[PDB]
Design an enzyme around this catalytic site. Structure first.
Site, PDB file in Angstrom:
ATOM      1  N   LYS D  32       0.797  -1.210   0.000  1.00 40.33           N
ATOM      2  CA  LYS D  32       0.000   0.000   0.000  1.00 40.33           C
ATOM      3  C   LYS D  32       0.832   1.264   0.000  1.00 40.33           C
ATOM      4  CE  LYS D  32      -0.619  -0.131   4.889  1.00 40.33           C
ATOM      5  NZ  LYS D  32       0.319  -1.256   4.944  1.00 40.33           N
ATOM      6  N   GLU D  58       5.218   6.819   9.204  1.00 41.18           N
ATOM      7  CA  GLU D  58       5.806   5.844   8.306  1.00 41.18           C
ATOM      8  C   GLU D  58       7.315   6.035   8.285  1.00 41.18           C
ATOM      9  OE1 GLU D  58       4.530   2.775   7.700  1.00 41.18           O
ATOM     10  OE2 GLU D  58       5.153   3.113   5.620  1.00 41.18           O
ATOM     11  N   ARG D  59       7.995   5.415   7.333  1.00 43.70           N
ATOM     12  CA  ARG D  59       9.452   5.448   7.347  1.00 43.70           C
ATOM     13  C   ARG D  59      10.000   6.804   6.928  1.00 43.70           C
ATOM     14  NH1 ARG D  59       7.743   0.861   4.878  1.00 43.70           N
ATOM     15  NH2 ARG D  59       8.390  -1.102   5.810  1.00 43.70           N
TER      16      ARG D  59
END
Ligand SMILES: Nc1ncnc2c1ncn2[C@@H]1O[C@H](COP(=O)(O)OP(=O)(O)OP(=O)(O)O)[C@@H](O)[C@H]1O
Ligand SMILES: Nc1ncnc2c1ncn2[C@@H]1O[C@H](COP(=O)(O)OP(=O)(O)O)[C@@H](O)[C@H]1O
Ligand SMILES: [Mg+2]
Ligand SMILES: [Mg+2]
Lengths: 281, 177, 277, 365, 210, 70, 105, 52, 52
Positions: D32, D58-59
């Site tokens: 995703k 997120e990253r």
């Protein structure tokens, strides 16, 4: 198959995006078509309570109800997802109070509580923040009483009290067809019938995805059309014969060639019960 | 007179042109028998190979020295380098001798081929040894078959086959040693 | 939802013992039918050294028989010879001939109609229900001589061992409609034999190829029936593995749900206790 | 009105609405972020409006990758040409404390809401992992002295998420097309943070792990992804009947998979074998290569138009392409290219070798 | 906050920019899995944090394929297009011939019918699987590792059945001229000058399967 | 019988019963994998049948009526 | 089980021997330590064990080692609850175990 | 499952238990018919695994 | 399923080799000799490897 009398609470239970609102919207739209043909005494005034939904979803429904003309008879009680949890807990009771105006003065109501499962989550929020001690899935103890208080207000009154009625349609969302959930099992015990909608029946083409073996009407054929009480009893039984003969020919082991007749006719009958959306018959 | 050069080996090469290339060639019943007819040999002097068969049993496949076969002309005997023969057999007794010892099967009819390599291939349907026949009920049905002859032309043959079978069966229980 | 996963372990465990019962039901039926398929192998041998073996002849009329099973947990045996049907039914037609397609076994009419429905004219079934006998294979042959072709094609699976079933085409030519017409090269191959019949050589060969038809039909539906039990045995072995691999994934899934509902009921109990203390 | 994404399984089965809320549901490694970078690649350049990328938990490596790849794409311009940029980035990534990850979705909307309300135009909001908003409030809620709800979340999960999602809408003054990645924890779609989000979205694209293990990318569950645009009065009856017919054979194939595992395909009716043959073909045809996945898959990516999607799946449903093998449909653009790939597959099975010598491998030249 | 426990930790493994020195830190978290269940809580948390996985299958480890790398599930997308240029040439065919090997072994492991084209795949797939398994505490340089896969994705090993491929590797890497490892190391990739030189050295190595 | 155990075991068995119940539990143990194949009576293995019929001879032996112990 | 450790640790550290220690049912060590955490009012962990399960085991199992003086080798019987190897009591125990001896009927 | 087939009253004939089902209470010709009916219904459920 | 003398001579060579390996893993114990009669056997490590 699951006919509904006036004054009967009927559950529309199913997973997400299985057509539970579409059964409920088509009950509201059809009352507009029926209210133009009946005398003034037996006209059904709908109330749609939208608990915890999007506001865009609600604005799509009042757009449909204005375009169909169903908004002349419909009250739209909207407690969306950004509303406070006491406004979504209380919106089924406020919509039922608006719908009980018609029951108490000799007219006929139709209340639809779309996601009573979202009312219980908003009632769990207030209970847990008022520090009431939690139970199953952190719900309060009185969450059966939350819904039995509300759904027992859908009644058919005496002729001493006007003869009015209120017909309820609670909507409950299950998770993976898990009707063994806490709030789902409470409302199956409260309501008379049950309209169970399935996901694999939905994608097989059968929509309205009615699980005919799990869908009940505890009022039964006492309050159904007499022109279908004699016709659909054949249809109820021929679909009951359709089910087990489709479980074995799923494998492809052998054929009896007399059970193949009931597999042929019920396949017409399953195809007969399909319907387009927003066009009630 | 030689329009179709057929055979097992020819069928392999042409079937690779019409079938898919995934499928290997079907087998043939020539790939399961090692004994041929025109193939030279297989006599070995005195005792010659006798393949006495039924649909349900292989009653003999070892070698014998003489076979008394019940042909439709009459009982003939086969020695080792016998003439090639296609012999339709009556209901009668096939006698398999190996030497001093002989085994006597009564058969129902069915052909017997002597191939050019000296291989005898008796091919009958029901081949009962006379040890397991009883001489009582043979005439009990033969007397009935000597009585019931209607104008049914299909039972004209079937009663004729009924009479000649028991009649040879009568005569071949009498002379036993 | 912890009873839906528990009732699937009810299903796969009963299937994995049904399919292991059918594995050894077919294994004992493979052995007592091997004692009948070896005795019957003898009688097909003289007719293939008397009349030879001629699969690819230019017959005017042919009857092709694909003998299949009656029950269908065989594992693609009834389809491999339906596939081998059209592999020989397209091969031997070089001139636009009549072909009558016959099927022995109830799983043949449901699969030969999928390829040739306009040439499919006969359906023999219920064959292996009691046993296979030569009188039964005679009557099947006499119904095949009502139509008189110039050649017959019998398609069956030769039971070689319990593992390999190489299919066979066994061909029978009509007595002088093609049969002597294929031996007579610079003389004749059949004229070596001294005919001891009642009537003519052309008349004994009429008797002799019907008997060659009934023999190689009796062998075909006895080779195929013993090839059917030995492919059901390999099919019901592959489904007990598949019902053991599925049962193993369900038990891992059940133990994960068993551990998770013990954690879930305990967190519900401690939360209700911490709300009071 | 429809939002054409160039993705086959999206534009056919669960088509996106141009001012609507879109959710991509995923279970840690199912794809995703690749899908949400493909929508940035396909939709956000032909959109002509401003974009906001709110990266929520997120990253940080992925924040640097998007930022650098937007500079070489000209979406972000640095220096004196900063005003010609089309995207603004708000980042609250997974090294932040749980207060910063619980509010960075709100400051990503505020940038998107200014363009909707004041500037009055069409915004694209891309929120990577709106689950991390719910999870960061759940880390905080234990320490605010609250009795926890079901699985262990905050008692206020539905109204915390509801108060944020109801701001992400299209109003009468401007539009926000919102694509949000939704993480599902332990692949559990009945977890209350995925389960609450489903009601807030016009189009849910559910990405499955079993679909990704069959090599099908994007790993979209065709029978679990849903749009409100799949309606015959919205997309037309030709589009609608193909999508419902594609779903019907994929569902009837799923009903067969219990028998195909145990008994095999040899026990099927040949009516049912035509189902398994067709539904294996459209399952491969729903996959496609991405122009953002070419940098690690090698395959160049294919934008498939909506008209080529509808006609291509209609051919496989009527039966026009039962000739071709099932691997010709795998990772191709449209139905022109499965015939281009089936020809190559047939050609290769013939020509495989005979490259001994007189090539450039001479030991002196 | 058990996600934040690990996410705030593994986020410190970064490659820094050139104004910060250009230094780097690469992390290898180890997660133990119960019965192969990758959809557990802590396992799926670290998959959402890290850039790839190295899945180590219990079933491949019991067959002696060690390291038991689940090739279909092990990912490295940040490290691809950052790898050895010589290995990137030869491993595209290696990943692909293993991609077909898993796909063909998915169809028919038991002897229904064996194509000659698919038994090329099971012959080349079992060749490359025995190629990749190596023994413990002896890591291989990347130039000896490129040549050994060059000798396997191409020809040069189809003579050996499956058994002596482990012994064919030291038959390869010791018998080729050790200058061919120096040019492949210093260029980084296989030049066309070194390409057919290395075809030449791989034809004069003596293979133990004869 | 497969799940009912006794960790004391046959050290507190009636001797004489220990002589004959030691082979009773074995013949029932072999019967238990052979049980649920007894719906295949038309299809038979004739050594599987002997443990199948004797296994049903013994489970019918161990039945009792209540309030009459032996 | 720590009283059993202490007797075996004297033979290891003072007598200098290679001691065997039989912890008969290491699961009942886990089960008893899980009860004393529940009685001390501690919140139970996953499936229902103590929060300190890996350090209740690891405190015992790390005294069983080889030192420079002698050795303790432990043969400890393992019960697997509900025939579930992924249960946290065998799964935490099997991280310490260097061999299994399965006795079969 | 008894109700879904149409048998009404949907009484599970095996799971229904009474204390009047002793032979010295209801006699032997009522007890053996009831234990005989339950044996035939229990056997059918063990065959319905293999019929289906 | 098939038979003992059905399969190959090498697969019977393993069966003969395994059955005398499966027997050879047995051993009489010195603590069991007070009620079994058979004396106990301590088997050294090199004698175990070279014996197998
Ligand atoms: N009878 C029907 N025929 C065709 N399409 C239908 C029918 N009923 C519903 N649909 C389509 O299926 C989708 C799901 O329907 P609906 O919104 O009624 O489900 P729901 O149970 O209300 O789901 P939720 O409230 O969880 O979103 C809708 O987009 C609708 O267009
Ligand atoms: N469309 C795709 N094409 C090819 N590979 C993909 C695709 N989507 C996901 N993958 C693979 O799966 C991994 C999932 O990564 P990502 O998309 O970042 O997962 P997440 O959903 O957890 O953010 C990718 O690194 C890639 O290897
Ligand atoms: Mg709804
Ligand atoms: Mg991501």
């Amino acid at each position: 198959l699951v006919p509904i009398g006036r004054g009967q609470r009927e559950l529309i239970i199913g997973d997400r995006q299985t057509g539970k609102t579409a059964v409920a919207i088509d009950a509201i739209i059809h009352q507009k078509n029926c209210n133009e043909q009946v005398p003034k005494a037996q006209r059904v005034y709908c109330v749609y309570v939208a608990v915890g939904q999007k506001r865009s979803t609600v604005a799509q429904l009042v757009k449909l109800f204005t375009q169909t003309g169903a908004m002349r008879y419909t009250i739209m009680v909207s407690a969306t997802a950004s509303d406070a949890a006491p406004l979504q807990f209380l919106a089924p009771y406020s919509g039922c109070a608006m719908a009980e105006y018609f029951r108490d003065t000799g007219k006929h109501g139709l209340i639809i509580y779309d996601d009573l499962s979202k009312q219980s989550v908003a009632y769990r929020q207030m209970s847990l923040l008022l520090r009431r001690p939690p139970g199953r899935e952190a719900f309060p103890g009185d969450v059966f009483y939350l819904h039995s208080r509300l759904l027992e207000r859908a009644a058919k009154l005496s002729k001493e009290l006007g003869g009015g009625s209120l017909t309820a349609f609670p909507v409950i969302e299950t998770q993976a067809g898990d009707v063994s959930a806490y709030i789902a099992t409470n409302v199956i015990s409260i309501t008379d019938g049950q309209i169970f909608l399935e996901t694999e029946l939905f994608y097989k083409g059968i929509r309205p995805a009615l699980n005919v073996g799990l869908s009940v009407s505890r009022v039964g054929s006492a309050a159904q059309f007499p022109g279908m009480k004699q016709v659909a009893g054949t249809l109820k039984l021929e679909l009951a014969q359709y089910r087990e003969v489709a479980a074995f020919a799923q494998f492809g082991s052998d054929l009896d060639a007399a059970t193949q007749y009931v597999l042929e006719r019920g396949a017409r009958l399953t195809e007969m019960l399909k319907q387009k959306q927003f066009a009630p018959i | 007179e030689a329009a179709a050069p057929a055979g097992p080996k020819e069928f392999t090469e042409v079937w690779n042109k019409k079938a898919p290339s995934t499928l290997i060639v079907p087998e043939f019943p020539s790939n399961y028998t090692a004994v041929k007819a025109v193939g030279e040999g297989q006599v070995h002097g005195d005792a010659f190979p006798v393949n006495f068969y039924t649909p349900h049993s292989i009653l003999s496949q070892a070698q014998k020295d003489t076979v008394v076969l019940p042909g439709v002309d009459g009982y003939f005997g086969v020695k080792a380098s016998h003439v090639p023969t296609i012999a339709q057999l009556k209901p009668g007794v096939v006698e398999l001798h190996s030497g001093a010892e002989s085994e006597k099967f009564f058969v129902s009819g069915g052909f017997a081929f002597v191939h050019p390599n000296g291989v005898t291939d008796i091919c009958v349907l029901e081949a009962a040894t006379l040890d397991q026949v009883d001489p009582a009920a043979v005439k009990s049905a033969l007397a009935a078959a000597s009585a019931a002859q209607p104008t049914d032309e299909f039972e004209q043959a079937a009663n004729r086959a009924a009479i000649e079978l028991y009649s040879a069966l009568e005569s071949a229980v009498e002379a036993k040693a | 939802s912890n009873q839906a996963v528990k009732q699937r372990i009810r299903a796969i465990k009963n299937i994995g013992k049904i399919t292991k019962a059918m594995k050894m039901v077919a294994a004992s039926k493979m052995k007592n039918a091997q004692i009948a398929v070896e005795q019957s192998r003898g009688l097909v041998d003289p007719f293939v050294r008397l009349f030879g073996d001629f699969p690819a002849v230019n017959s005017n009329k042919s009857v092709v028989v694909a003998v299949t099973s009656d029950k269908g947990l065989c594992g693609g045996l009834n389809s491999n010879i339906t596939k081998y049907t059209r592999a020989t039914l397209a091969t031997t037609e070089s001139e636009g001939k009549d072909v009558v397609v016959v099927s022995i076994g109830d799983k043949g009419r449901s699969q030969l109609t999928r390829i040739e429905s306009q040439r499919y004219q006969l359906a023999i079934a219920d064959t292996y229900k009691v046993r296979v006998t030569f009188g039964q294979a005679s009557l099947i042959v006499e119904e095949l001589i009502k139509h008189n072709p110039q050649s017959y094609q019998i398609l069956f699976n030769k039971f070689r061992s319990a593992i390999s079933f190489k299919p066979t085409v066994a061909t029978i030519l009509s007595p002088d409609l093609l049969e002597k017409q294929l031996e007579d090269v610079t003389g004749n191959s059949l004229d070596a034999y001294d005919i001891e019949a009642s009537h003519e050589r052309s008349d004994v060969l009429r008797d002799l190829t019907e008997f060659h038809l009934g023999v190689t039909l009796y062998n075909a539906m006895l080779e195929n029936n013993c090839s059917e039990h030995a492919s059901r045995m390999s099919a019901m072995e592959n489904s007990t593995k598949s019902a053991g691999e599925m049962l193993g994934k369900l038990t891992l899934d059940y133990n994960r749900k068993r551990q998770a509902t013990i954690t879930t009921e305990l967190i519900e109990i401690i939360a209700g206790a911490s709300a009071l203390m | 009105e429809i939002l054409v994404t160039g993705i086959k399984v999206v534009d056919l089965l669960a088509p996106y609405q141009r001012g609507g809320k879109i959710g991509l549901f995923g279970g840690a490694g199912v794809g995703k972020t690749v899908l949400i970078m493909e929508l940035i690649n396909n939709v956000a350049k032909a959109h002509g409006g401003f974009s906001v990328f709110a990266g929520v938990g997120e990253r940080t490596r992925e924040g640097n990758d998007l930022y650098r790849e937007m500079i070489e794409s000209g979406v972000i311009k640095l220096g004196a040409e900063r005003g010609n940029s089309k995207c603004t980035l708000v980042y609250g990534q997974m090294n932040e404390p749980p207060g910063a990850r619980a509010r960075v979705a709100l400051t990503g909307l505020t940038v998107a809401e200014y363009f909707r309300d004041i500037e009055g135009q069409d915004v694209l909001l891309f929120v990577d992992n709106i689950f991390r908003f719910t999870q960061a409030n759940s880390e905080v809620s234990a320490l605010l002295g609250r009795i926890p709800s079901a699985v262990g979340y905050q008692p206020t999960l539905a109204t915390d998420l509801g108060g944020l999602q109801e701001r992400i809408t299209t109003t009468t003054k401007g539009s926000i097309t919102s694509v949000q990645a939704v993480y599902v924890p332990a692949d559990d779609l009945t977890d209350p943070a995925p389960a609450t989000t489903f009601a807030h979205l016009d189009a849910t694209t559910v990405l499955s792990r079993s679909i990704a293990e069959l090599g099908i990318y994007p790993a979209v569950d065709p029978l679990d992804s849903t749009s409100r645009m799949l309606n015959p009065n919205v997309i037309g009856a030709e589009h609608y009947n193909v999508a419902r017919g594609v779903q019907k054979v994929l569902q009837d194939y799923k009903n067969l998979q219990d028998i195909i595992a145990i008994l095999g395909m040899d026990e099927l009716s040949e009516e049912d074998k035509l189902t398994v043959a067709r539904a294996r073909k459209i399952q491969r045809f729903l996959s496609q290569p991405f122009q953002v996945a070419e940098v690690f898959t090698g395959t160049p990516g294919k934008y498939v138009d909506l008209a080529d999607t509808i006609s291509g799946f209609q051919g496989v449903l009527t039966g026009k392409y039962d000739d071709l093998p099932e691997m010709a449909f795998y990772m191709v653009g449209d139905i022109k290219e499965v015939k281009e790939k089936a020809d190559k597959m047939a050609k290769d099975i013939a020509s495989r070798k005979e490259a001994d010598n007189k090539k450039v491998s001479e030991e002196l030249k | 906050d058990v996600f934040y426990l690990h996410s705030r930790l593994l986020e410190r493994a970064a490659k820094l920019s050139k104004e910060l020195g250009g230094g780097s830190l690469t992390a290898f978290p180890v997660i133990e899995t119960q019965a192969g269940d990758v959809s557990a809580y802590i396992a799926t948390n670290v998959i959402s944090i890290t850039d790839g996985q190295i899945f180590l299958e219990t079933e491949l480890f019991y067959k002696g394929i060690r390291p038991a790398l689940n090739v279909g599930l092990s990912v490295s997308r940040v490290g691809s297009a950052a790898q050895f240029p010589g290995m990137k040439q030869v491993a595209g065919t290696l990943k692909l011939e293993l991609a077909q090997y898993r796909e063909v072994a998915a169809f028919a492991q038991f002897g229904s019918d064996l194509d000659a084209a698919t038994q090329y795949v099971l012959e080349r797939g079992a060749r490359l699987t025995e190629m990749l398994k190596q023994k413990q505490f002896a890591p291989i340089p990347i130039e000896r590792q490129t040549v050994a896969v060059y000798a396997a994705t191409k020809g040069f090993l189809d003579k050996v059945r499956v058994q002596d491929i482990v012994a064919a590797e030291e038959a390869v890497i010791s018998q080729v001229n050790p200058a061919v490892f120096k040019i492949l190391k210093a260029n980084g990739k296989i030049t066309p000058a070194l390409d057919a030189h290395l075809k030449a050295e791989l034809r004069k190595v003596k293979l133990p399967g004869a």
